[PDB]
Design a protein around this ligand. Structure first.
Ligand SMILES: NC(=O)C1=CN([C@@H]2O[C@H](COP(=O)(O)OP(=O)(O)OC[C@H]3O[C@@H](n4cnc5c(N)ncnc54)[C@H](OP(=O)(O)O)[C@@H]3O)[C@@H](O)[C@H]2O)C=CC1
Ligand code: SF4
Ligand code: SF4
Ligand SMILES: [Zn+2]
Lengths: 95, 111, 126, 114, 75, 208, 176, 376, 292, 96
């Protein structure tokens, strides 16, 4: 979702939203400052982190050649979830 | 004959004697050239070999067959241009010793 | 035909037509691009690079790109020696600053020197 | 460095060929400035011609002086023909400023400059 | 009929594959050549821009864009 | 080996070595190097005082026709006493063979402009005059080709940079096109692509 | 093997010369040319009517330069810069930043559409198929500013269709 | 000017409608391609050889890829050789039909333009279906053809070859022994074969005027040694005969395409060397060495041994030459292009000495000048 | 001054100078050449228009990549003017139609337009608001044009008193109006002294006034050094031309005067070289058939 | 198809080309798109146990150039390449 800058407009997902005396605002006159209201971080919070019974597991991303190459992550520490570098979704183990 | 191939090519009535007197002028102008240069050696060898091919040729089509580099007035043009360079090769004296040195690492390529 | 020689430099600096500020003010630098230390290997050595001083790159006022007023910013002249570098620099016109070539000093090293009964080199973990 | 010559054996024919070039440029101005329909007096164009000759005072070698005469003769060919245009002749002029300074104070305020 | 008489030219309804939201109509034939298999009829005021006249490309949704540029064989 | 490696020739390599040795013997006056690479195309490398004699001898002498010309290029290399390299490239009609005729020169000493034996080289010589500066004595017309009229510099040099010293735009102040010092809109971010670890060990020059 | 043409003498038979004279007087094969013109006159044209009957295409067509994201997930790009390394006109401008969690992502992603030459080298080099050549071609702009794209423009351009791009990749993934 | 096919400034200093001199000024379309390839790498600068000659979209790609292979001592697999020869003849057909079409526009001849550009629209649909490009298909990586043809191509090539034989017979019906087109263009453009040698002419000029010379049947640089055809040679000058030469090269190109569909083996796409060609998707997503080779092959490019090579192909305009100079490096040092358009343009004044300006337009028409290729 | 407002690099073509210009008018003559010199300088120009977009497309190729920007307004509203002057470093006021339309008189354009825009300019906190005015705009009679511009001078001096009022004489250029009417012929004898001023020295004085402070408050004048008679100028313009919606306020203007005022500084005090009318008159005296 | 027989007779009457047969209207001769996907195999490699890169390393076999003469009674004078014999006339209809 979009936040509220003191300009009364839509901020960006990365912090480049304008100051109150930027004339780039006054070259945004009368047209859409377009923004993708879906943000990247807003989907990770709704991810069910799965529970695989092995120790060091695999990740492909739903079929080879549609996604990312085989990355292998570890489930040693129970204080930190195993985060993929490509997928951006975590993994856990149980025993 | 009639309806020859190339555009700038109109053969004469008696090709063999024209080609022979061309090659005798080749041997003559080569006779002006000194002996120890290899130019005389290789040109006199190749022209006496081609003339010795031609001396046993009664037919024009047979000479176009056996002599390689045909057909007829391409051979004549080859002869005329060889005569012109021989006349130029009296000049320029191109059998001198080697002209002076390169930088001697100029042709070392990968720099 | 054996014309006269003179003890002079060469003067193509008005034959090539480059503007005068880019003639005079561009203080060149001749240097050896040394070993990229995060890599290994000196294959990228042995080539004297003549390059030029850098100037400003400002924000493009629409995209934040680095728009420059520099023709002579991206040149790299690849040489093999130093005398020919000086000759080319005197030939085309500008001035220059010179780095040396700093080869690695070879040092005596041995695994039988890594181990010793009465010297204080002790890996203690291998 | 017993270099092959170009046109001249010393500076004498170099000066003779460049003064013949300047003679041709003096008698070359009025025809072109009447033909090409310019906005500039004949004397101003002739003064930029003699100014462009004044720019090259440090040129010494006979090869280089002859090569400048070759460039000038090629350009006089391309201007006695209408291969070139009004744009090129007005590009010899420097009228649309560009008033770019030289004072260190004005190289300092309008700065990031030597 | 004046709808299609001054829309462009056609009278060739008779295959009736279907329609889609924004109301737009899609007709696939096999009787003609390759190039007039699949044709489209644009509706009126699909987003309030009075699109009976001055019709635009890409007023179609993208699944019919893939279907209609002859990349597939089924709607 | 038997697939995926381009097979070399033997007898054609032998014949081109024999022919290069032949030319090198029968012209002692203008010969420095003859060489054959792996893909068997002959190379002759020449001092720049016998250019028209070598081209007349390589047009005729009847055991080398070589009637087709290519490219002339004086390929620019720094660091040398003689930068510029005239590269002729000749094809024969009766023979099916290829020779390269590379003579060398520096920035100012002209060569004899071999247009009088090959009429193809006229526009080639004018073009390489416009782009390099290898002046051509005994030549009818040296104009400028592939360049602007008011532009100069011989821009295929390694001194002239990628973008030019000139820029054109339009103004309505004087209703015409004017020139400016150049103003790029992007950096042209140059990519460092010089890999370590001895890309080809067979081409190691003796280290200084 | 050569087949050289235009070699004939004109046949001097009486029948041949009267047929050629009738050809000269009546302009006969000129009328044969008119017959060919009528034979194409009485065909039916293979045109398409433009907004209503669009021309065909190919599955590997390269248009819009969109971006994909993960199946129920976030941005597929990593900012690995291979697309700048292979983009020949250097239209790819990428300045990355890692995000607020730590995984490496972007800030400044720019495809200069005025400079793009539509090869597909960024389609080849992209190790996750993040950047994809789009299917359609309507840029068609009354301005210059609207040509140059940014990250949110390209992601809105990738949110206008996904199953389009997924269908084309599922058609094309075995070949490339 | 619309008869100036492309752009060609031409200062004709004439006597009135019957000339004195003409000078082709070219370089108006100058783009700096040699300097750009000096500041680029190989794979990144292959679209310059897409865009240089903008008619032979596959022939010059074949020329540059075979230049790199002849430099690099690598044989491609034979299936890629057959497909490359197939598309070489296909693009040869497109170039000959553009030559006939632009001569038709330069001479009048309004409708065969439209007929044969409907056929060339079918050609462009073939390029779309193969490479995904409209008119500039890269498609020929150095190291064999990448991203090969799907199922559904050879059927269309077969049926289009039958239809095209019918259409070239219909073009011979409409034009080709027409009365006044012939009386318009026979007696013009005669160049002596001695000077056709020594003006540097090549290809179709040396076809139509005299000499018998084909790079294909004299020099095997691809699978041309296994296919059989014949090539027309000129009677004596006479631009009409040059037109007949173009038409018979078209029909024999159709015969070569029929033979090539008869002799297509289903072996492999690319070479057996991952350090030359990038690997495919499954190896890219699974195996380590494929990803390392992918990554360094698309950052740096494969290293190339130093060499100053040249090769030339029989492009439909003539001896298309590419001259590479490669340091032991990943960027080639200096490359140059021998343009048959440049060579055929060199003899323009001598072709148009003693004629009128209408023949000057027809001599621009008799040689398919494009001037992207002439520019270097 | 905010960041990325600071000047950068050599001049022109992405030289982000210390001005952000907002120009009113500029669809006509003098404002278009002013935007021409601003795009030569390389700043961002906000310009509105109520006209057909042809002239604003015509001045599109002036600035750099996406620099200049266009909007809309009218002589009725306040919101669009405020939207124009939302974020403006410098702002100039050129306005005025030289004939009466059916809804805009000579009245109330110079009265109603500079009041609202200069008031919201002061209410936007801008610096160096510049407003044009004709020379000798007097309350004295026989000049509706000059008396309305004098009322405009009074209003601009009333609200935001330290605005730069600029008064040149008549302006000869490339698309001049009064010299076109001089050329617009086909018997009358009169006299009145007059001296004009050239357009590019005027606009160089404008940009020196807009980026050189110590200039505010006090009004400036820009007159060429000619100082001769109307009859000599008619002889001059017809000797160079080689010939043997209009009101009579035009003829009142060209028979008024050109008198000087020594209270205020001019060309040399502001520091731009004055060019006479000779070769620029040779430029602008075309259309003749075969003497060139 | 979809034409009357009278205009078909006129099309044959205009020229003997049989325009009904091949007509430049591709109807269903195009293969029906979206077939089941075909696999793309690998040729003379990817078998294990033998395929060394030490063997087929044609890239690393680029030889340095071999040289003859420099600055550093003979029955001879061969050609660079053998004189290729003159070609053959056409089988199917040359002129003549
Ligand atoms: N020498 C001097 O000192 C002189 C100075 N001037 C002044 O200099 C400027 C340029 O001179 P000039 O050539 O005569 O005129 P111009 O045509 O160049 O400029 C007049 C401008 O005023 C605009 N304008 C006028 N009335 C309205 C309105 N009701 N609504 C919107 N826009 C309006 C016009 O817009 P549009 O065209 O789009 O309708 C136009 O942009 C003017 O401001 C004028 O007052 C004029 C004459 C002499
Ligand atoms: S190649 Fe793909 S993953 Fe890499 S930076 Fe470009 S878009 Fe991102
Ligand atoms: S298609 Fe080509 S030019 Fe376009 S972004 Fe990709 S690599 Fe760059
Ligand atoms: Zn993963």
């Amino acid at each position: 979702g979009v936040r509220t800058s003191p300009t009364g407009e839509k901020v960006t997902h990365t912090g480049q939203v304008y100051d109150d005396e930027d004339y780039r605002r006054v070259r945004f006159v009368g047209r859409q400052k377009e923004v993708n209201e879906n943000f990247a971080i807003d989907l990770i919070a709704e991810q069910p982190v799965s529970q695989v019974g092995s120790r060091v597991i695999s990740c492909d991303g739903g079929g080879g050649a549609l996604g990312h190459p085989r990355v292998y992550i570890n489930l040693d520490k129970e204080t930190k979830t195993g985060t993929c570098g490509y997928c951006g979704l975590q993994f856990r183990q149980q025993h | 004959k009639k309806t020859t191939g190339l555009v700038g090519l109109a053969v004469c009535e008696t090709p063999h004697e024209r080609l022979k007197i061309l090659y005798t002028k080749i041997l003559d102008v080569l006779g002006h050239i000194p002996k120890n240069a290899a130019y005389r050696k290789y040109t006199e060898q190749i022209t006496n070999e081609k003339l010795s091919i031609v001396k046993a040729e009664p037919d024009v089509k047979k000479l176009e067959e056996q002599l390689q580099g045909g057909q007829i007035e391409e051979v004549i043009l080859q002869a005329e241009n060889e005569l012109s360079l021989a006349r130029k090769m009296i000049q320029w004296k191109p059998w001198e010793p080697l002209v002076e040195e390169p930088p001697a690492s100029q042709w070392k390529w990968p720099i | 035909t054996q014309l006269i020689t003179v003890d002079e430099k060469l003067d193509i600096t008005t034959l090539t037509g480059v503007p005068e500020e880019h003639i005079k003010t561009r203080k060149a630098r001749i240097f050896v691009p040394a070993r990229n230390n995060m890599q290994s290997g000196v294959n990228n050595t042995k080539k004297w690079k003549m390059e030029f001083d850098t100037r400003e790159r400002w924000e493009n006022p629409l995209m934040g790109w680095a728009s420059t007023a520099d023709p002579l910013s991206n040149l790299v002249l690849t040489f093999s020696t130093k005398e020919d570098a000086i000759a080319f620099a005197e030939k085309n016109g500008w001035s220059y600053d010179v780095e040396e070539r700093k080869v690695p000093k070879p040092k005596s090293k041995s695994y039988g020197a890594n181990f010793s009964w009465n010297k204080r080199t002790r890996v203690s973990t291998k | 460095t017993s270099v092959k010559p170009i046109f001249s054996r010393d500076m004498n024919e170099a000066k003779r060929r460049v003064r013949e070039l300047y003679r041709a440029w003096y008698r070359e101005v009025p025809n072109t400035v009447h033909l090409f329909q310019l906005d500039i007096s004949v004397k101003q164009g002739r003064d930029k011609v003699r100014e462009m000759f004044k720019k090259n005072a440090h040129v010494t070698d006979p090869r280089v002086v002859d090569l400048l005469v070759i460039k000038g003769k090629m350009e006089l060919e391309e201007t006695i023909n209408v291969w070139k245009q009004r744009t090129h002749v007005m590009r010899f002029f420097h009228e649309t400023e560009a008033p770019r300074p030289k004072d260190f104070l004005s190289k300092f305020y309008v700065g990031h400059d030597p | 009929y004046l709808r299609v008489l001054f829309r462009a030219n056609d009278v060739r309804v008779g295959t009736l594959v279907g329609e889609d939201k924004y109301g737009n109509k899609y007709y696939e034939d096999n009787k003609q050549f390759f190039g007039r298999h699949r044709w489209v009829i644009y509706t009126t005021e699909m987003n309030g821009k009075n699109t009976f006249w001055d019709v635009d490309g890409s007023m179609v949704p993208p699944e019919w864009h893939r279907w209609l540029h002859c990349m597939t064989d089924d709607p | 080996t038997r697939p995926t490696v381009r097979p070399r020739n033997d007898v054609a390599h032998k014949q081109l070595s024999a022919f290069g040795e032949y030319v090198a013997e029968i012209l002692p006056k203008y010969v420095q190097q003859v060489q054959v690479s792996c893909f068997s195309e002959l190379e002759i490398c020449i001092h720049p005082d016998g250019v028209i004699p070598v081209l007349t001898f390589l047009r005729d002498h009847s055991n080398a026709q070589f009637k087709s010309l290519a490219d002339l290029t004086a390929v620019d290399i720094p660091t040398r006493q003689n930068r510029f390299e005239i590269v002729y490239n000749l094809l024969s009609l009766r023979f099916n063979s290829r020779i390269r005729v590379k003579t060398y020169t520096d920035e100012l000493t002209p060569v004899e402009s071999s247009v009088s034996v090959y009429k193809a080289a006229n526009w080639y010589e004018r073009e390489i005059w416009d782009m390099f500066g290898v002046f051509f004595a005994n030549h009818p017309d040296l104009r400028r080709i592939l360049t602007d009229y008011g532009f100069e510099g011989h821009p295929f040099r390694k001194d002239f940079p990628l973008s030019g010293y000139v820029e054109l735009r339009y103004d309505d102040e004087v209703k015409r096109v004017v020139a400016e010092p150049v103003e790029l809109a992007q950096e042209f971010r140059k990519f460092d692509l010089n890999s370590p670890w001895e890309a080809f060990p067979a081409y190691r020059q003796p280290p200084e | 093997t050569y087949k050289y043409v235009n070699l004939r003498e004109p046949s001097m038979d009486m029948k041949s010369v009267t047929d050629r004279a009738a050809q000269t007087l009546l302009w006969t094969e000129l009328i044969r040319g008119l017959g060919m013109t009528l034979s194409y006159l009485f065909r039916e044209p293979a045109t398409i009517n433009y907004p209503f009957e669009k021309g065909p295409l190919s599955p590997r067509f390269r248009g819009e330069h969109a971006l994909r994201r993960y199946p129920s997930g976030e941005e597929r790009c990593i900012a690995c810069k291979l697309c700048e390394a292979v983009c020949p006109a250097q239209a790819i401008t990428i300045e990355a930043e890692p995000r607020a969690d730590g995984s490496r992502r972007t800030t400044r992603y720019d495809i200069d559409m005025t400079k793009c030459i539509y090869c597909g080298f960024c389609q080849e080099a992209c190790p996750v198929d993040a950047i994809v050549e789009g299917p359609n071609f309507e840029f068609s702009t009354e301005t210059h500013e609207e040509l140059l794209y940014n990250k949110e423009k390209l992601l809105n351009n990738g949110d206008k269709w996904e199953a389009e791009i997924a269908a084309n990749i599922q058609a094309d993934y075995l070949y490339r | 000017h619309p008869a100036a096919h492309g752009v060609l400034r031409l200062v004709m200093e004439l006597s009135g409608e019957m000339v004195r001199k003409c000078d082709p000024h070219i370089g108006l379309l100058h783009r700096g391609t040699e300097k750009l390839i000096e500041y680029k790498t190989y794979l990144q600068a292959l679209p310059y050889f897409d865009r240089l000659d903008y008619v032979s979209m596959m022939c010059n790609e074949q020329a540059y890829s075979l230049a790199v292979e002849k430099l690099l001592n690598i044989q491609p697999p034979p299936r890629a050789q057959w497909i490359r020869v197939l598309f070489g003849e296909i693009t040869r057909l497109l170039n000959h039909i553009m030559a006939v079409t632009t001569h038709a526009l330069d001479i009048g001849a309004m409708t065969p333009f439209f007929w044969m550009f409907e056929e060339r629209e079918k050609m462009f649909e073939f390029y779309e279906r193969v490479s995904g490009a409209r008119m500039h298909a890269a498609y020929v990586r150095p190291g064999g053809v990448h991203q090969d043809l799907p199922l559904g191509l050879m059927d269309d090539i077969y049926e289009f070859s039958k239809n095209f034989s019918l259409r070239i017979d219909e073009l011979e019906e409409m034009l080709t022994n027409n009365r006044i087109w012939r009386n318009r263009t026979v007696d013009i453009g005669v160049v002596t074969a001695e000077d056709a040698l020594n003006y540097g002419f090549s290809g179709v000029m040396l076809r139509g005027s005299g000499i018998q010379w084909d790079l294909r049947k004299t020099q095997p640089y691809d699978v041309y040694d296994q296919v059989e055809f014949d090539v027309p040679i000129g009677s004596r000058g006479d631009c009409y005969d040059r037109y007949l030469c173009r038409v018979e090269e078209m029909r024999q190109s159709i015969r070569i395409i029929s033979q090539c569909l008869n002799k297509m083996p289903p072996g492999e796409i690319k070479v057996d060397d991952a350090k030359v060609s990038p690997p495919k998707r499954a190896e890219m997503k699974t195996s380590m060495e494929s990803l390392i080779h992918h990554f360094k092959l698309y950052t740096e490019g494969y290293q190339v041994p130093p060499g100053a090579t040249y090769t030339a192909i029989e492009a439909p305009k003539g001896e298309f030459g590419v001259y590479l100079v490669s340091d032991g490096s990943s960027r080639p040092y200096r490359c140059k292009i021998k343009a048959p358009g440049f060579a055929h343009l060199a003899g323009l004044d001598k072709m148009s000495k003693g004629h009128m300006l209408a023949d000057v337009v027809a001599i621009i028409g008799t040689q398919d000048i494009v001037f992207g290729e002439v520019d270097r | 001054l905010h960041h990325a407002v600071i000047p950068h690099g050599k001049g022109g073509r992405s030289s982000v100078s210390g001005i952000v210009a907002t120009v009113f008018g500029a669809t006509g003559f003098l404002g278009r050449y002013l935007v021409n010199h601003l795009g030569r300088m390389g700043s961002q120009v906000i310009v509105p228009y109520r006209c057909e977009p042809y002239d604003t497309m015509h001045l599109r190729p002036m600035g750099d990549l996406g620099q200049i920007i266009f909007m809309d307004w009218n002589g009725r509203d306040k919101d669009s003017i405020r939207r124009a002057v939302e974020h403006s470093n410098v702002v100039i006021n050129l306005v005025g139609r030289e004939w009466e339309t059916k809804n805009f008189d000579f009245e109330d354009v110079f009265v109603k337009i500079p009041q609202a825009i200069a008031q919201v300019s002061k209410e936007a906190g801008v610096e160096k608001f510049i407003h044009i005015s004709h020379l000798n705009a007097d309350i004295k009679s026989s000049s509706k044009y000059l008396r309305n511009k004098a009322v405009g001078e009074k209003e601009v001096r009333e609200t935001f008193p330290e605005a730069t009022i600029i008064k040149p004489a008549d302006i000869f250029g490339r698309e001049d109006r009064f010299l076109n009417y001089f050329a617009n012929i086909r018997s009358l004898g009169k006299k009145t002294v007059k001296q004009p001023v050239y357009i590019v020295d005027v606009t160089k004085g404008i940009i020196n006034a807009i980026k050189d402070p110590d200039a505010r408050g006090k009004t400036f004048a820009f007159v060429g050094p000619n100082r001769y008679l109307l009859f000599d100028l008619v002889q001059y313009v017809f000797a160079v031309a080689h010939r043997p919606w209009t009101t009579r306020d035009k003829v009142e203007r060209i028979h008024t005067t050109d008198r000087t005022l020594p209270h205020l500084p001019g060309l040399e005090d502001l520091g731009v070289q004055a060019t006479p009318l000779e070769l620029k008159a040779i430029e602008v005296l075309r259309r003749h058939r075969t003497y060139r | 198809a979809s034409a009357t027989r009278l205009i078909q007779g006129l099309r044959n009457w205009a020229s003997g080309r049989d325009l009904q047969a091949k007509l430049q209207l591709r109807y269903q001769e195009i293969s029906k798109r979206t077939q089941p996907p075909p696999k793309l195999p690998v040729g003379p490699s990817h078998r294990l146990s033998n395929n060394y890169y030490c063997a087929r390393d044609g890239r690393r076999e680029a030889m340095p150039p071999s040289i003859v003469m420099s600055s550093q009674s003979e029955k001879k004078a061969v050609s660079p390449a053998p004189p290729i014999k003159r070609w053959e006339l056409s089988q199917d209809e040359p002129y003549l």
